[PDB]
Design a protein around this ligand. Structure first.
Ligand SMILES: NC(=O)c1ccc[n+]([C@@H]2O[C@H](COP(=O)([O-])OP(=O)(O)OC[C@H]3O[C@@H](n4cnc5c(N)ncnc54)[C@H](O)[C@@H]3O)[C@@H](O)[C@H]2O)c1
Ligand SMILES: NC(=O)c1ccc[n+]([C@@H]2O[C@H](COP(=O)([O-])OP(=O)(O)OC[C@H]3O[C@@H](n4cnc5c(N)ncnc54)[C@H](O)[C@@H]3O)[C@@H](O)[C@H]2O)c1
Ligand SMILES: CC(C)(O)[C@H](O)C(=O)O
Ligand SMILES: CC(C)(O)[C@H](O)C(=O)O
Ligand SMILES: [Mg+2]
Ligand SMILES: [Mg+2]
Lengths: 342, 342
């Protein structure tokens, strides 16, 4: 049977989510919503969507959908999730989850009280290369992991497609580090303590565009999360996340161009962990775009079976707390206890 | 007209220093000293040295040398440098400089009061690839540096050539990280604050074999110093230090195999930054062995010109403070102020 979705926020990234919902087996978009009638019209016509709302309140009043997909900017996330919980509509919410850890917890609390699933659309861990790093480590190929590096250093002009990124006092950790930190948790488990440093290099923005974060994982592992939008390389890696993992019996090295090198007791293997190229995908976004389909299918599968999602609201709190801790650490110059925040 | 040197400590690394002394123009070794008569004979015969001593006191009593090269283990460093100062003999001392920052400071003050040059033999910054990274950065090719990584991750059995490294409670930071931290200072300047984590992976050693360090440089830059002797790769990089620098106008990437990539406003260049393999050198140590010639020739030039050496006693205090601070940080879990130690 065929699940019916409403997408709220028909913006730049929502277009990818709409393409992917078409591709998803067992779900489709029955209605869309946007405050901007130019976007409502553009996306409605492109994807052949008849039901079109100028405000979310009216969309929820009319009903007719089994889940909601919140692709708006952060300012409206809490309100829209709360509206979803009040109407008992299962909700997907884009990152950043909320404006603070408090708002995030209240959002998780409200959805639990209404007994509806809540998933954060956190798609970086759903990329094919990141899945492959996880599979290799889980298999036992390199023994117990003790050290990692998770790197996203770019000079790509993200500000064209996403103008708001140049305007906030907070930029790179909230926008991108949120993903890289999620990957660190996904691969090496939850974090106990964290230390962070930030810098603004680009003179045309208001926010920090370089962040370096040292993680002490609960399992004993140390990792480095380093992110930059001021790194000028001869070959632009956007939007590849590069990963080094050292274990007691081996190494994983995910390097640029999706090359995956695994050394264990048996010896070295090299694999191509490149993503697929979907019909609607576009270089260099294709890795992210594939991961949109993966996470949207995952949601659809879990909604049908009754299980929890991988980047559930509850789980995402442990990612989001690292974002808020990194800002705190960067300002105070202090190591921050994550356990105490949650 | 050559400067006549005396070498104290005819151990395994001293062989490299003796070879290089032969190559150095304007200096040579006239006497040697070792407490072990087997080593005194081996090195004496190999290099054709007539004057041979069983103790440094008798050596300094007889005199007849212009400088002293101390290649003993750390225990006798303070005593030998003090003997040198009291006999007004310019002194080179192997790393680690001393057992504590306190001893090193007193060693520096004694040489300053005796009006004699004191160089620490700290040779990693004299490696051809590392000099190449310095030169590129100073040229302004990548603008002002804001971020760096300095990385030495090996699975190499250093314990055969140097069995004392397996014995002590302190291992990788004191032995290897001392170099990596010195390089970080050389490239990005002095450090204000420091945070460090350590781990023992290898079951068959007493000390820590993994260390990850975060540096806040006085000039505003942030760097990562990560060192490991428990890293099992498909190609062994021992003993290469891999360096990434990001600047306002470009990047530097010194990668495995002495590959030096520089991206700036005029495109990207790729060059070979590998060492000259000297007649007496031997792979893969030829990197370290060339730097022995470079630093000893440097000493000899500065002893003639009367200028301060690059890794002088006074300079090396600012590297040694970082080793001490890193052990402290790793035990405390706290960030350490470097300026308050000096
Ligand atoms: N990898 C990823 O998953 C990924 C990639 C890019 C962006 N994002 C995230 O997606 C979100 C949206 O990013 P974007 O670049 O598409 O922004 P955008 O500004 O292009 O789109 C937001 C849209 O939502 C509408 N909107 C805002 N508030 C609303 C409300 N209360 N009701 C109805 N409509 C509303 C706006 O009119 C706009 O069209 C952001 O939170 C961003 O962090 C995620
Ligand atoms: N890249 C480098 O610069 C590099 C490389 C290896 C070792 N080292 C350093 O060089 C030093 C020596 O290392 P090694 O591996 O050659 O050690 P080693 O044990 O081979 O050599 C030390 C020698 O000094 C002698 N000795 C000790 N105390 C003495 C005293 N009071 N008087 C006279 N002789 C004495 C010993 O008999 C021994 O032969 C160490 O401090 C080490 O940290 C530096
Ligand atoms: C990769 C980008 C540009 O930071 C995007 O905002 C994202 O969150 O995926
Ligand atoms: C770190 C090494 C290679 O073991 C050696 O002691 C050195 O200082 O070069
Ligand atoms: Mg579908
Ligand atoms: Mg000579």
């Amino acid at each position: 049977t065929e699940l019916k979705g409403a997408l709220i926020g028909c913006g730049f990234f929502a277009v990818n989510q709409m393409h992917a919902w078409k591709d998803v087996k067992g779900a489709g978009i029955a209605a869309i919503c946007d405050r901007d009638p130019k976007r409502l019209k553009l996306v409605g016509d492109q994807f052949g969507i008849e039901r079109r709302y100028g405000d979310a309140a009216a969309l929820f009043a009319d009903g007719g959908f089994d889940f909601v997909d919140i692709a708006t900017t952060v300012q409206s996330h809490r309100a829209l999730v709360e509206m979803a919980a009040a109407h008992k509509v299962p909700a997907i919410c884009q990152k950043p989850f909320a404006k603070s850890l408090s708002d995030a917890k209240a959002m998780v609390r409200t959805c639990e009280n209404a007994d509806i699933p809540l998933m954060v659309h956190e798609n970086f861990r759903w990329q094919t290369p990141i899945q492959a790093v996880k599979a290799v480590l889980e298999s036992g190929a390199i023994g117990e992991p003790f050290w990692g590096r998770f790197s996203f250093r770019s000079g790509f002009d993200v500000f064209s497609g996403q103008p708001y990124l140049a305007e906030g006092e907070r930029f790179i950790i909230e926008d991108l580090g949120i993903h890289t930190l999620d990957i660190a948790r996904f691969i090496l488990g939850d974090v106990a303590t964290l230390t962070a440093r930030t810098k603004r290099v680009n003179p045309k923005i208001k926010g920090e565009d370089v962040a370096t974060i040292l993680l002490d994982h609960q399992n004993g592992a140390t990792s480095i999360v380093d992110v930059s939008y001021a790194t000028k390389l001869g070959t632009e890696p956007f939007p590849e996340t590069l990963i080094d993992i050292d274990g007691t019996q081996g190494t994983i090295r995910l390097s640029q161009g999706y090359r995956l090198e695994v050394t264990g007791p048996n010896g070295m293997t090299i694999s191509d962990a490149s993503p697929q190229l979907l019909s609607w995908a576009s270089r260099p976004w294709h890795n992210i775009q594939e991961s949109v389909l993966a996470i949207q299918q995952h949601w659809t599968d879990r909604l049908s079976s009754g299980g929890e999602t991988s980047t559930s609201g509850a789980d995402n709190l442990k990612t989001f707390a690292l974002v808020e801790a990194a800002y705190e650490s960067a300002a105070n110059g202090r190591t921050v206890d994550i356990g105490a925040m949650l």
